[PDB]
Symmetry: C3
Subunit: 237 residues, 3 copies
């Protein structure tokens, strides 16, 4: 209806991306997606950004690519879900790392009800992120579930009262942003680089990623801060 | 004891396969397995079948291949488990997609207690379908668990009062059968084809499978039905 | 402070390894790690050992390699966790198969708080062992969780009152040790050998491992014992 189809805001080291078509339940638009991709590039390219939050306006969530298919942000992405996260909203959710929902949020992948296909990658990701039979139930029946059920399935990690999803997400982003950005981002890189590698092969990649972190200046600041019984002040190097 | 070792029945678009040796707790027989494999071929070859249900007779579950090892049905398979699903019964369970159990059902892989090995593929599948340490507990101790515990582990998705497992399974099959068969079956195909592929490689397979669905006639009927605010009438093309 | 940095004890077929630096919250030392690796070799080389338990002394857990990175014991390993299992303790935990914790135990991977990296392999293993978003929460925020929360996540399987973790672990080891060691160890071998192999390829490895078990003398003793309605007496051959 009014304004840009996605808003981008900054809060400390956290970049907040708000899908903003509330009159259309934040249904994806091409302008919404262009704003999202450039925010994604901002997250990757700005060393001052340590965390990203994805949310929707107007009591809905959503009902280089869109749902981050073929691309994943190099910094942590927290979903703050209020209200419906159906179809596109649940596919996007699987491209986020940490997941908070309001109590009244709903999840579901309804594409097959209309003989459509989930193009956002749910048929690849969902069985890898929650127990197989629970994933199959969602993908094949297309039924909608509550936030409580989603947490029970392991699809999200936190359920908060309605309206507090963004608040809790910002608490989590504040904890991430206070951690060493080089460590946080190396962990993500390892998770992605080692996917579907048997662990003896994966450990070789993971060990080299880790040793690189230990060679940083920030890896000296962390221990110094702990010995000086004070909070660390990381510089992304 | 009496009758064929497996019964096959039709209910709408759903084919129902009933392991039928209740005097022997539906222990697998070669005649039971031959009847199962030809029912499986019926599911795959009959475009009118959109869903399959596997259950057992007589208050037991079970206590191209048997437990669908080396072969998986190309259409969704729902387990309706009443009573014991031990050893063979829990291996078969892992070849099904959606899983309903009566409250008094029991699960377990007891082979190692007798220095036997689970030949139905549990040592491959189980750690991939539920959390690693829960899978290890089952496989290495051989202990039996309740339906409630199985749902807690993510091994099954639904627990219903005793005797209602098939009823709930038929509700779920009715929802699947009302969905677009080309979409439902492409999702399964993607899940199977992309297994253990890193997601950037998997997404290429998954995208092509999906686009093929969108090119179908049924993918036009689904949206037309929604716009005409009516239920869709799919033709498997 | 006093005594060897790790104790090794035997209870029937079970070898018990106790990280023993309680004054330092059982923080890993090089002497602790040397004692652990030789105990590991004992587990692998002694046919009389059928199960191993890893625990810590003094109401802490821990706060060929250390956390079994690059190496895994060929026999089942049960963690008995009392008190803090932070950082090193939670990485080690992921190299164990069956997991018991006292009610007051705590888990967490805090490395990133100090811009350090989890060198024990958590960035590879954790997302494979529990739901993706729960793993990401732990690894990226570094926050600590209770034993109840860990069981909810699927990170451990059993929560017992404080002080009873080793007792429950010994119950579980007794059940494992009574099972056929050739079967138990083949299951582990299959799990490890088939990791990240698509199941149709994995099943070929898993079938050959299993058939080898069935050719053993113990695979005849198990059925004979059941027919003689008596407990089996396995000889690891
Ligand atoms: Mg997995």
């Amino acid at each position: 209806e009014s304004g840009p189809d996605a808003l981008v805001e900054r809060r400390g080291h956290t970049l907040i991306v708000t899908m903003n078509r509330p009159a259309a339940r934040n249904a994806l638009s091409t302008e919404m997606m262009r704003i999202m991709v450039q925010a994604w590039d901002r997250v990757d390219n700005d060393p001052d950004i340590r965390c990203c939050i994805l949310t929707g306006a107007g009591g809905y969530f959503c009902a280089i690519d869109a749902l981050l298919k073929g691309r994943r942000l190099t910094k942590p992405l927290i979903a703050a879900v209020e209200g419906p996260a159906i179809a596109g909203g649940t596919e996007i959710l699987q491209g986020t790392d940490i997941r908070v929902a309001g109590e009244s949020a709903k999840f579901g992948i309804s594409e097959a009800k209309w003989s459509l296909y989930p193009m956002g990658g749910s048929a690849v990701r969902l069985v890898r992120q929650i127990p197989y039979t629970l994933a199959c139930d969602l993908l094949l029946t297309g039924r909608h579930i509550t936030a409580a059920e989603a947490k029970e399935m392991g699809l999200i990690g936190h359920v908060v009262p309605d309206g507090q999803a963004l608040t809790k997400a910002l608490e989590l982003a504040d904890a991430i942003s206070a951690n060493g950005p080089l460590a946080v981002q190396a962990i993500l890189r390892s998770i992605r680089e080692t996917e579907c590698m048997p662990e003896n092969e994966a450990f070789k990649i993971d060990t080299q990623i880790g040793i690189k972190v230990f060679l940083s200046d920030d890896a000296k600041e962390g221990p110094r801060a702990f010995a000086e019984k004070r909070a660390p002040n990381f510089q992304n190097r």
